[PDB]
């Protein structure tokens, strides 16, 4: 619970990016039964950001949709386009914290193709859906984005 | 075991002691204060835990195994009989025990056995196990 909050996942099918270090790796470890996660590709970070990507701006949650919205709030850190944003995320840049926190938790729909699997709450490895499923995270996220 | 193969054919070892006391609420009062008096004893036993152990001449295998089979009926819950890799009640598989014995190393004792170690006083180690210290027969 707490962890799921600190990673800003407080409703089903919502998603965020996480930079991997020991100190977050353990956090992931703690919430495996309740999440599905993996290594996202350039392709799915781009389409995540282009379509479902919103900024937090004096709260509110503002669509990206114009580049001046980003330069306004992220420009301080270099970063003055939607692609600058994507670039910071994917390369885990020096300013990933600000760049990624700026991103409001993505809100996906349920997968179109379905889940694979007849039961979600076992681990991927056991025919289920949760845990690190590595590069197979893009197939899923795309079906939900 | 004895009637079929003789009272000195074999060695039976109950390998399990009933150290756990079973209580009983024998019986005006109802459930008020209901701490049993001792009723009987019982061994608490594991999975894979040996219950009986028996040693013979190989040429009696069946007779022993049929004995353990018949005793099975005397017990709750499935148990299964197993042929050992070990030499009798010893800790050693039949070859390793043979290698140690037909060396020097092993010496008789009441029912069991003693083994020369490379540790300790060279002196009173040469005392015991004289038939070592040649390294042949």
């Amino acid at each position: 619970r707490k962890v799921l909050q600190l990673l800003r996942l407080t409703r089903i099918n919502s998603g965020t990016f996480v930079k991997v270090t020991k100190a977050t790796l353990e956090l992931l470890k703690l919430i495996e039964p309740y999440v599905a996660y993996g290594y996202p590709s350039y392709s799915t970070i781009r389409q995540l950001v282009y379509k479902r990507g919103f900024g937090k701006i004096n709260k509110q949650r503002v669509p990206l949709s114009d580049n001046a919205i980003i330069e306004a709030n992220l420009g301080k850190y270099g970063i003055l386009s939607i692609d600058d944003l994507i670039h910071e995320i994917i390369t885990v840049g020096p300013h990933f914290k600000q760049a990624n926190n700026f991103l409001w938790p993505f809100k996906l729909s349920n997968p179109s193709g379905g889940w694979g699997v007849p039961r979600k709450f076992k681990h991927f490895i056991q025919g289920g859906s949760f845990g690190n499923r590595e590069e197979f995270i893009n197939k899923l996220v795309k079906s939900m984005n | 075991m004895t009637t079929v193969s003789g009272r000195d054919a074999f060695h039976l070892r109950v390998r399990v002691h009933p150290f756990h006391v079973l209580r009983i609420n024998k019986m005006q009062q109802g459930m008020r204060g209901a701490w049993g008096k001792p009723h009987g004893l019982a061994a608490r036993v594991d999975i894979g835990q040996i219950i009986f152990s028996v040693r013979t001449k190989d040429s009696n295998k069946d007779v022993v195994v049929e004995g353990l089979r018949r005793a099975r009926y005397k017990f709750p819950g499935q148990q299964k009989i197993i042929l050992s890799k070990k030499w009798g009640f010893t800790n050693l598989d039949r070859p390793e025990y043979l290698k140690k014995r037909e060396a020097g190393e092993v010496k008789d004792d009441g029912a069991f056995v003693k083994f020369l170690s490379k540790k300790g006083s060279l002196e009173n180690n040469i005392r015991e196990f004289p038939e070592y210290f040649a390294a042949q027969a």
Binding site: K22, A23 | K85, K86
Partner: protein
């Protein structure tokens, strides 16, 4: 019925450590405390006067007072949904200086160094701590070390 006296439940807590009974070695007394020192608490069952209550066993606090044979330790004890301030009069045999800070202090002294060493050179510092990074690429060689292939083993019984 129930019993809840002062050292209740403490059988092995206050108990003495295998082969370590007897006099307390003299350094326990040559050690020196000042206000603000952080100390860890552990009771020495051999010293009955001036002994912490079991709740404070294993606990760390800050010195607030120094007397002839004692130090006063403040501990925050949380009772309810709130902490309260507790002051503990302990004899020196139940207190030791805490290491809980030695990594900090060592790190400051050093952070001051790497900085001066940097500043008066041509900046570039980086002196916050960082978690275990995931490891990098690497090329493992085969030369001297071809892969050995294992498979799983059958069932056996040895007994």
């Amino acid at each position: 019925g129930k019993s809840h006296g002062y050292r209740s439940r403490t059988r092995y807590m206050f108990q003495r450590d295998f082969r370590k009974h007897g006099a307390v070695h003299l350094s326990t007394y040559l050690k020196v405390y000042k206000v603000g020192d952080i100390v860890d608490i552990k009771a020495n069952g051999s010293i009955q006067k001036g002994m912490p209550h079991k709740f404070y066993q294993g606990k760390t606090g800050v010195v607030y007072n120094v007397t002839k044979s004692s130090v006063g330790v403040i501990i925050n004890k949380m009772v309810g949904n709130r902490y309260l301030e507790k002051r503990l009069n302990l004899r020196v045999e139940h207190i030791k200086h805490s290491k809980c800070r030695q990594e900090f202090l060592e790190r400051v002294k050093a952070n001051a160094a790497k900085r001066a060493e940097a500043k008066a050179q041509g900046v570039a510092v980086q002196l916050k701590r960082q978690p275990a990074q995931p490891r990098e690429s690497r090329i493992v060689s085969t030369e001297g070390n071809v892969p050995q292939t294992l498979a799983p083993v059958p069932y056996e019984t040895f007994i």
